[PDB]
Design goal:
The structure is cut from a larger assembly and holds two copies of chain A and seven copies of chain C.
Chain A: E1 19-24, E2 29-34, H1 38-53, H2 59-71
Antiparallel strand pairs in A: 1-2
Chain C: E1 3-5, E2 9-14, E3 37-43, E4 46-47, E5 55-56, E6 64-67, E7 74-78, E8 81-87, E9 91-95
Antiparallel strand pairs in C: 2-3, 2-8, 3-6, 4-5, 6-9, 7-8
The chains are: A alpha+beta, C mainly beta.
PDB class: chaperone
Keywords: chaperonin, protein folding, chaperone
Entry title: Crystal structure of GroEL14-GroES7-(ADP-AlFx)7
Chain lengths: ~80, ~80, ~100, ~100, ~100, ~100, ~100, ~100, ~100
Amino acid sequence: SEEIGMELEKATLEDLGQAKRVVINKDTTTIIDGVGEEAAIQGRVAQIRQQIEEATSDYDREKLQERVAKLAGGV
Amino acid sequence: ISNIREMLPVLEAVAKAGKPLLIIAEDVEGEALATLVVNTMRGIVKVAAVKAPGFGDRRKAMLQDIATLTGGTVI
Amino acid sequence: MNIRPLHDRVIVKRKEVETKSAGGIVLTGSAAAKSTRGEVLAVGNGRILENGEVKPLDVKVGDIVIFNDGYGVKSEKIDNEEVLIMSESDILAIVEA
Amino acid sequence: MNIRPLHDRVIVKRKEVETKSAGGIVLTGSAAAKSTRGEVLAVGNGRILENGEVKPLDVKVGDIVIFNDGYGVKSEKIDNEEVLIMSESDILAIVEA
Amino acid sequence: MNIRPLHDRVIVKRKEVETKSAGGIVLTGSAAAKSTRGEVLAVGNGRILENGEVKPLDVKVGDIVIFNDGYGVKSEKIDNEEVLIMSESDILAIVEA
Amino acid sequence: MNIRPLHDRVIVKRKEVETKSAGGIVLTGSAAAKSTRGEVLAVGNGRILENGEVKPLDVKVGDIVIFNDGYGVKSEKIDNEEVLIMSESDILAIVEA
Amino acid sequence: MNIRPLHDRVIVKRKEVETKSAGGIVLTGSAAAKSTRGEVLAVGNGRILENGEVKPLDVKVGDIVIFNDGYGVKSEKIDNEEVLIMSESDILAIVEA
Amino acid sequence: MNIRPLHDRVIVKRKEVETKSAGGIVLTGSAAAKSTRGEVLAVGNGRILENGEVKPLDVKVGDIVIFNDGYGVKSEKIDNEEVLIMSESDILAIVEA
Amino acid sequence: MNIRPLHDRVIVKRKEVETKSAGGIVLTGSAAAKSTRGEVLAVGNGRILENGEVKPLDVKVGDIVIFNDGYGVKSEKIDNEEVLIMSESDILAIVEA
């Protein structure tokens, strides 16, 4: 993002994500099996787990659970 | 606060005391904000920014109260 | 291929896009601005005007120079390197010692 | 018919419209842009200004030159070949060795 | 009456309005455009500038010349023939052999 | 009173407002246009520029001349006759024989 | 106090605001217009340009002159008299005999 | 501190803001206008242009001069006095005797 | 690094942003305005124009000068000091004694 003062130009292969496979339809992108380690994942997941805890709204709870499922199990 | 230039002198005296800084301005808009962000992000100097309480006349007086509690000068 | 400026023209390469430190310790995030400093690479003979032969230029190949990014300044691509071509008139000073 | 530039004028033919490779291995698809490089074909005597006879130009028939596609640059058709006519003033450098 | 250009001025007559064949066999229908080619008819002494007498022009009465249809180019009517008057500065080249 | 142009200035009187016949037999009705032809009446010394004395003009009192009705052309009233005042620069040619 | 023009400058006083008679017997009522004629009162040394000393002007104190009421023409008040200050360049002719 | 104009520059002090009497006995109330008259205080060497050394100016320290309050005229503050700085070109005449 | 102006260029540092006292005893609060005064730091050889060698400048390293903050005035950063670069043409006077 540019909000951290980055430009696309100073980005080497190491800034790019990786997976084993991806598929995209007319309107559906899907990433199977990322290279990100289950340390980092389970870390980030436990963060969004505490987003639900302090989501004081209802529509705010809906989205958060969605990403947690996108990251934890499946949908 | 639009122009980062206005911060520089202060932001640097704060980089010698090694202590973080809270910026309570009337507002911190596009230009300056984006910068502060970039700066605080790279672990340069820890800084946060927040709008002043209320609006109109009391804002200035309420900001002033804040000065008193903290022993600082309204600018 | 190395370039060859055509009398009165100087070829320079820009320096750093606001070398992140302006002021001192504070790292100025990219605040919409460019660099005015640059290094000389090649220099032409001199100005033709006045008839009288051609007077050589006051810039030697390799000075660190401050210029005005005016209209007469053009941008070019050589071996894939970011270079500029302007006349001496657009060059303002040198950074010596 | 071969052309004949009228002192101070140079006749050049443009090169390749972003020779598809910019950067290295990557084939840059036509990204809305033109070529600034060109080859000399014919050259006039020289500039008349200052009265004093006519001083010859610094470009020999057949150099590879970088120019500024400015306003004074015109486009022409000769035997059905894409050619340009500008003054030396509009020519910026040479690509030697 | 035959005309008489006043030093530095050239009198030329335009050629064909996109001679219908551009490209080769294809007859380009009138696509909103004019002709840049023309023939000399009369020529003045020369440019006065610089004081120093008057230097004659490089165009002989009757050349086939390419010019720039700029602002300094005026249009005139002689015996009922379509003619143009511009200075040498507006003439760019000759079509020889 | 007869006039007296002040060096470099020419005094001319316009001719006919589209002499009703353009083309041949057809009488062109006034189609919103003026006349570019005129006759000389008086001529100043010459241009002062360059210091060097004053070079006389190439127009003799009484030529039939074509001029450009530009900005530098002014309109005047003498004894009640419609006259114009411009410099030689604004005069383009002569209609001889 | 009488004035003193500073080389190249002429001091003139306008004449009559459309002297009510234009055409002949008919008294043209004020039709929104001014006078272009004027009389010389004082004259400076001459033009400095070109270095070379100072060449005196071609207008003698007291001629009746036609000028162009251009931008370089200023308006002034002397002893309470309506006067104008312009350069010779703005003066076009003289009304002699 | 007394000032020091840098060749070609003149330092003048304005006179009175419409000296209340214009016309004669009638005291013109401030009608939105300024003064064009002024007095010289200091004078630079001369104009450098043309190379040739430096020709001195035609204004002596202390004349009463009429100038054109043009663009090249700047306003300044010295010891707390209202002063102006323009070049000779902006000065039009002198008020002698 | 100390700077090096390229002939005809002067390097100056501005003075005080309306030194709070204008008038006398009254402290003028910042009323939206800048300073026109400045000190010289470095000076180039001289102007090249006219061919004829190079004439040196009339400003010695260290004068207190008044300048016109025009367009040709640029702003620069040296060792972290606020500096300006303009030509002599933009400098108007000196504050001596």
